Design a protein around this ligand. Sequence first.
Ligand SMILES: *[C@@H]1O[C@H](CO)[C@@H](O[C@@H]2O[C@H](CO)[C@@H](O)[C@H](O)[C@H]2NC(C)=O)[C@H](O)[C@H]1NC(C)=O
Ligand SMILES: *[C@@H]1O[C@H](CO)[C@@H](O[C@@H]2O[C@H](CO)[C@@H](O)[C@H](O)[C@H]2NC(C)=O)[C@H](O)[C@H]1NC(C)=O
Ligand SMILES: *[C@@H]1O[C@H](CO)[C@@H](O[C@@H]2O[C@H](CO)[C@@H](O)[C@H](O)[C@H]2NC(C)=O)[C@H](O)[C@H]1NC(C)=O
Lengths: 379, 653
Amino acid sequence: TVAVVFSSSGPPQAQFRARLTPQSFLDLPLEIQPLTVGVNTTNPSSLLTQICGLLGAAHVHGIVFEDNVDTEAVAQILDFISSQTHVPILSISGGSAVVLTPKEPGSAFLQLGVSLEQQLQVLFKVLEEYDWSAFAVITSLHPGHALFLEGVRAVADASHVSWRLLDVVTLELGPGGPRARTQRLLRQLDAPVFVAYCSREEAEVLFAEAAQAGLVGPGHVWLVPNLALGSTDAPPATFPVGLISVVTESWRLSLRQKVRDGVAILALGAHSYWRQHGTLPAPAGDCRVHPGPVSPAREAFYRHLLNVTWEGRDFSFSPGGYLVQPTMVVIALNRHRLWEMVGRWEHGVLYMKYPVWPRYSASLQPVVDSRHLTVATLE
Amino acid sequence: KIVNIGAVLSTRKHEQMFREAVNQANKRHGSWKIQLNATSVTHKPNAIQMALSVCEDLISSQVYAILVSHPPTPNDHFTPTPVSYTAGFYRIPVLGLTTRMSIYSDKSIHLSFLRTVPPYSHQSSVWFEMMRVYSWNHIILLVSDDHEGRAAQKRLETLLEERESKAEKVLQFDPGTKNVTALLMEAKELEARVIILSASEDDAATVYRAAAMLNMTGSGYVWLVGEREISGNALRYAPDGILGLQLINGKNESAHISDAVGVVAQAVHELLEKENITDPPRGCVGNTNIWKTGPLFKRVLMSSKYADGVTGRVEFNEDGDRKFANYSIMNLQNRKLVQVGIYNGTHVIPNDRKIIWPGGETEKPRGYQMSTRLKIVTIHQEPFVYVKPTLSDGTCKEEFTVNGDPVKKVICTGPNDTSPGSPRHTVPQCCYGFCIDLLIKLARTMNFTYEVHLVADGKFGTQERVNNSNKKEWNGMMGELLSGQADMIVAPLTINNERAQYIEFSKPFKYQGLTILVKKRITGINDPRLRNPSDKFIYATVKQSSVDIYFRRQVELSTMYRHMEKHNYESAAEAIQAVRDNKLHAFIWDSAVLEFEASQKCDLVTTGELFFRSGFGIGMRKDSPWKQNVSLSILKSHENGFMEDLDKTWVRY
Ligand SMILES: *[C@@H]1O[C@H](CO)[C@@H](O[C@@H]2O[C@H](CO)[C@@H](O)[C@H](O)[C@H]2NC(C)=O)[C@H](O)[C@H]1NC(C)=O
Ligand SMILES: *[C@@H]1O[C@H](CO)[C@@H](O[C@@H]2O[C@H](CO)[C@@H](O)[C@H](O)[C@H]2NC(C)=O)[C@H](O)[C@H]1NC(C)=O
Ligand SMILES: *[C@@H]1O[C@H](CO)[C@@H](O[C@@H]2O[C@H](CO)[C@@H](O)[C@H](O)[C@H]2NC(C)=O)[C@H](O)[C@H]1NC(C)=O
């Protein structure tokens, strides 16, 4: 048996209850009966009680999570839960769907996303199709900067092409302070391509400052990873058109589709399992007692869970709590302040919607500009 | 103007200690401006229940900071984690005093956390200092595979590659396992006399006992470890001498609380002066927001100067540790620890004591354990090294050369298996030839006993990109040399850019170029038949060879190599047979081998002049002592003419 939880969307939660009311989807090769839980607000005590009490009340085997307004520092609690009660969980979306690299030793979190190295290789692959090679790296004083800088430095030295790098800059991006030191320094730059890694508020403040000190015209291009851009459904202001980022697949899908996907993953795991051992794995659950050394049966179950298929996709998990061989899409800001697809990535080859990068003037009319001569030939 | 702080402890009297400390803080600092309250709760075993109780207590008060210590229970990791996580969701700072785990040093997972004692990691830095003071250069690294182990090692190679001398082979073994004899058996072959260890307390006795069993604890070899392995050693498995270290006020838990209360009381005034005092209060239902200025509070707290040293001046490092600390060096003789030297901020100061090493020699032992036995690898090669089956007795036929001398022979193990299809079988054979004579000459020149064993897979060696990986991996004889199996290569090796980065080949002893074989209008550099390919005149060569890289460094000859890579042989003999068989049209590598083969096996000729220049030479691992003398001696031998004399015996016949 499995359970599901919904979080932090009132009017949608009515549709969530309506879609929970069906007996089953009647497709999964299992006879597990779901159960639903709904929590008013996301808080530590609330989540702790509503998860372990529910888990110990009705003898469940597995649980799957659902996202929220995407406020940070929420996955750690679920990781602690997994460590304590030794029960596998699964995240599907939202801010909780961000990689948490040094997970607890004995846990099994299985949050789907993209690791920073994989999340970064795509920008270098797309930066070679047009071959700009400027590399003005801007990083804020954020906790995750150390791994990012090390990864980019390591990749730069083992790549295919020369990749001339201009310089690296770090700056304080706090909510309040004297701007002058960063403001004068930022304008002391010259590079056609920028890559920046920071948080949402840091993105707002840096982008406003750059727009103030004339670095947002049609000549430059910005690259940001998935850690930024927040909602993915609400377009904020002050964003210069042309921002490029990379996000995973199924972003435009529905919550019902995502929860069905998670249910299918766990069901296919169980379906592959019962053939090996003959029955469902024993459900270990105890909020209060907290026993358990390393258990070989549940470890074997976790091993058998790591590889699935079907539904026109793939989910192969590494020892780290993240999937490998991923399928994501390049996204960009269209001329009407709206997100749209640009490029796909399937099996280590890259594509693009356009053969050239448009770039935009102040008005809707683009500037063809000089150079980039069109040349024709035939076989 | 009432500021409340909390703390989680276990000693019922320690709450009175905190109360006395805050009373002293009120009596010392402050003047009719702000008063500070205090309260604390005792730890409870059920971790989740402890978290719930702590968050409810925070709900019952307007706390600003949390302070925790080590309870006596052996489940060390259990106590700090829940309060830390439930604090991270609010960014309320927490300071630990007696928890030294390394996972808490990663700012990504624990948002706000400060440790008042240096972690286990900087033992690597003090180890580097101790290596500097005692003039020790080569160190073997024996660390476990746990997260603490990799962090400690990482700091170590950073501070060592600061000198860029690099470390010897680093050995990783799984935690919580026994029968670790294999790792030490592998280490025993290598030459080193200083060994360093860092692991779990229980595993220390396990790894210790095997050392006594394998008598590695004799003289010469020397031990040194951190405090982690100090306690469990004397418990049940007697030591044999170990340099170590400890902290001054370890596990006192009295000075630390005073220091932390002092520093937070110093910080609160500066915070109140910041003109933006947003009160947290205890919203545990609906107050889903962060205390608005936590980042600035943490930033200024990290910058706090030492309030009062008392027991010791305390500051904070950039990562969140305490820089400029001290350690006491101890020794393990007669099962009674004694101080021998005192660590300063950077340097170490001995103090009128006598140091003893496991052997019993009073004088400081000399490291680097210079060796005398050498390993050598070689490959099958037509004109340079003959390999022939041994005779039935165990040696092989002791024939006589025509020119009144016996052809010297040596016993070579070899794999006795060809191609990846055939499984490993092995059989001792005997080897002889030009290079073997060159080697046995060196045996007359200096003192060392060779043990020749042939190559594994029969490939000369190239650099290949690992399939779906980050780093390229070497393959073949060069890879075996770089791994550490042997320390020299005596084979017809070409010198090129790809090899010169790692292994220093010196003083070439025989020059050679490149030619092409045909059976009997081709130009080697560029010919219409070869520059433009067809169904006839197929160009092919042996795979995983230097010529592969050389052709891979071209432009249209790059396309030539691209269509050549579709075909590949695994040995020279196959090509020699095919040239007669006319199935293969062309063949391209080193001039000397092909010239000798054409001289011996008639009806075959080489076409075109040499289009390249190179040299053959021995290769050693970098920074090896033998290189200077072997290069010096080979030139004298060449000047004398013995190399010239051997040629007519083996090249011109
Ligand atoms: C996922 O990988 C695991 C590999 O362990 C597969 O599970 C096993 O596959 C072996 C193959 O011989 C079977 O004999 C075992 O019965 C399976 N269980 C064990 C012990 O792991 C699994 O099949 C793979 N995915 C697929 C496609 O099934
Ligand atoms: C200082 O903190 C103490 C906490 O030990 C406060 O005492 C009360 O203690 C009871 C339990 O013994 C709690 O239920 C109350 O909530 C505490 N009071 C408050 C206001 O939280 C004491 O009142 C505090 N005094 C000041 C001036 O802050
Ligand atoms: C290279 O060979 C020379 C041969 O003379 C070595 O010089 C001798 O070195 C040993 C110890 O290394 C001394 O005991 C001898 O007294 C030296 N001989 C003379 C004439 O001084 C030299 O040490 C060797 N060096 C290396 C790096 O191998």
